[PDB]
Every structure is written in structure tokens, then in C-alpha cells.
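Example complex used in Figure S2.
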Amino acid sequence: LSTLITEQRNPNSVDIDRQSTLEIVRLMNEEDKLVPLAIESCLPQISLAVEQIVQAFQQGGRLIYIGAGTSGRLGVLDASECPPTFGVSTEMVKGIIAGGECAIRHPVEGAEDNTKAVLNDLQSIHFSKNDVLVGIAASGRTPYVIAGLQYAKSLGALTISIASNPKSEMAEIADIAIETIVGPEILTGSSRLKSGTAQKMVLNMLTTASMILLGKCYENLMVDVQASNEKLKARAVRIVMQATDCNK
Amino acid sequence: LSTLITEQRNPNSVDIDRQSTLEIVRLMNEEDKLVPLAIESCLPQISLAVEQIVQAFQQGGRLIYIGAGTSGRLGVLDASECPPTFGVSTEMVKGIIAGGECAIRHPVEGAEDNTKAVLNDLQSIHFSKNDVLVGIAASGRTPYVIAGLQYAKSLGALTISIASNPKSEMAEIADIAIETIVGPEILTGSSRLKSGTAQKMVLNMLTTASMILLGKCYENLMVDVQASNEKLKARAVRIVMQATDCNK
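Predicted assembly (496 residues):
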């Protein structure tokens, strides 16, 4: 844990437990400003991932996310938004979380250390060399994710790692390593903060960019939207009008 | 929908469906840089919310999040991280999502328009004037959330609104209005992007700041961590050492 930035103490928060409410949120905001800068540095790798994901998609493959705790939950979150936004099948982008569905709401004892469970999770969805696997873990050393990436790599599938520590074991295994160096968290080890934000930003790019390139968009209009409520239904009507000056 | 920034088209993405992969992710990154700036503007309101949440917590109340779709999922995500990070009961911070558990993975037809369902959802957890209710909706007009805030307000509970459009109906009802003006999304109406990031950042501040003030922290060390895996167990040992120069 001593060689991980994610586990490092932030010099600016040493006396955070003695600072005013405003000073605490201000400090959190200043650190937040650093996350977009950390992603900018990874754009070349993120872009490559999108290119590779689009090709896989065109080959009939799926985009698979794996992770534990918060990282896993973010993969589930991003995946859940693809069908309603781009009108795609729920199978196109799948988010897998260590520990199963119970892990979405709460932690599952030793879930991220189960190196055998990930193989079962991937075999259950018939993971194949045609799919793309994105391993998400701020530490870059989550056993469950390392094993998932190793398995996928051995099968012949393209692998991508998203982690917050440089030269991680995950990055050493993955074909494409996205390293979001966000720096020490305000609360030491609280990766749910800056790394969580970084992961959401990267995941959003992987799906948004890939879906746009696949045609699930016209100009900057969400033409493949799945209206499931009044707002979205009213937006669908609005889109049609914006694309071609007509009326309701 | 024509008076909502969230539904506005972004001038910089008009031909996004015709741009290279790198140009797409770059544009998304430039827009992302704007989110922390949008939060900075709300710090005074966010800080006030924390102060009020801490008092409620000290009075025995809970922090309750309500939202639909992505907004609801983020409230669930933030809530799920409090027990393992601050060692608190699962009842202290609760995330409620329109549509029930099914809504975590996928959309539930008309869930965000059900103004009666929110009353049932709040009554089920015995919501009271002693609790604090945070209504989360980028549009600021989600019927399910508006009704939730109205009910809570009438009961006598402190209410907080988090939305991305100024002077929303939610902000008009809530006691404290946090307005994260992030600007038009790259994909028109795709609030899962900038507004989602903004909401996560605000929620993270509400719980991190409040928990720190309650003593669920020492210096910047996560002393109340709940070790559920080798990493966290190794961190607990590390924390003890960092606080007082001892050894394993």
C-alpha cells in the first residue's frame, strides 16, 4: 500500500478534521478540478480504446465492464444508460460487479479477492475473444479484476485497464492501459472520490464516443432515444423538429 | 423543454457525428473541465447543506436521497459507500430511486412521473421532519422528485434540491437550492454526462464533509473504515501506524 498514490495522504488535508465546513468543500472542489486534467493526459489511450471498441461492436462483440465496489457500480451505471440513450440491446454494454447483484447496494466480504468468481461471472455471459473487456480498479491491483483481465487476454479478447496508479499489474496485463493519475484523495484511500469521478468520465467517453461513431446520433441529437417518460417522449418530438423544421 | 439548459444543443458538437474519435473525446474533456467550475459557484449552498445535515444527524435524523434514472442511481451509489467508509449504519444515508430496485439496472416506464409513488417510498422508510431530503434531478422538473420535496417540506423536514437548470420548480420548493449550471451536454439532453458528474461531486461533498465533521475521521485518515477485503484490512493496519508510529 506504500507504493500506491491511491493510498497516499494528501498534504492539503492533514487537518481537514479541524477545518470549517466551507474550507472542506472548497478543498474537495480544488482537487476535483484536477480530475479533468488527469483525463486529458489519457485522451490518446481513451481514443484508441473507442476505436477498438467500435471495431469489436461492428464484429458483433459486446463491451464488458468488470469491477468491485464503487468501480463495479460505475460500470453498471454507465451500462444501464446505453439502451435508453442509444436504443441498443441491453447485451451490447454489460456491467459486471464482483459479488453479484447484492454488491450494488452493499459490500460483499472478500468479493474483490475472489479470483475464481470472475471466471464464473464471465463464462456465465459467454465472454469470448470477440468481446472487449474493461477492467476498472483505482488501485490497479484488485485481484478479482487482475484475474478477469488475464482470462480475457488468454482467451484472445482485447483488454483495457482503468486504474489510478501508474504501472499497475492491471496495466501490465491489459492491451490498452488508461491511467488516470488524479493524485492523493482528500480522505486518504477514499477512491470513491477523484478516482470514481475519473472512472465515470472515462466510461462515459467509451460509450458516448463509440455509440456516436456507430450512428446512434445525428448532428448532436439523441435520435435513438427510448422514450420511457413524458420528458423523453417530449424530447423525441423536439428532436424530430430540430432535425427537420416541422411542428407537433 | 425549450426553456431548459439541460435540453439545449451545444454549439461545439453540431457536427460531432462527423468528427474523428480523438476530437470527440477531446470535446467531452473540455466540457468536463467546466463541471468543477460550476460546482465552485455552488459552494456556499453546498456548505450550508452540510451544516444543516450535520445538525440533523446530531438530532438523530438521516440523510435521504431521491431521484429517478441516473440521478437516483448516483444517490444509491453515494449512500452505499458511507457504511464501509465511515462505519455508519446503513440507515444513516439512504438512496431512494423512482421505480424501486428494478430501476437500478434499467428504466421503469413512467417511474419519474409517478407523484404518488414517492409518498409511498418515503412513508415506507418512515420519513419524518427530523430527516433531511435531497431531491436530485438535472432537469429540476422531475414530477416524482417535485412531489417528494413538496411532501417533505409540508411534513416539516429540511429540503435540498440539486438541479442543472436555474430557477427550477424544485429549487422553488426546496429550502436550499444547489444549482449546478454545467451548460448544454455534448449529446443534447444526455444529462448522464456533465450533470451526472456534477451530482456525484455534490453528493460526495455532502457525505464526506458531514461525516468528517461528525468525527468519522482523524486528520485525513479513514479511521472508521470497515475492512471487508485484504486491501481495506491492510489499510486499517496502515492507518493505525500513520496515526501513531507503530508497526505490524
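The first helix of chain A runs from residue 21 to 32. The first strand of chain A starts at residue 63 and ends at 67.
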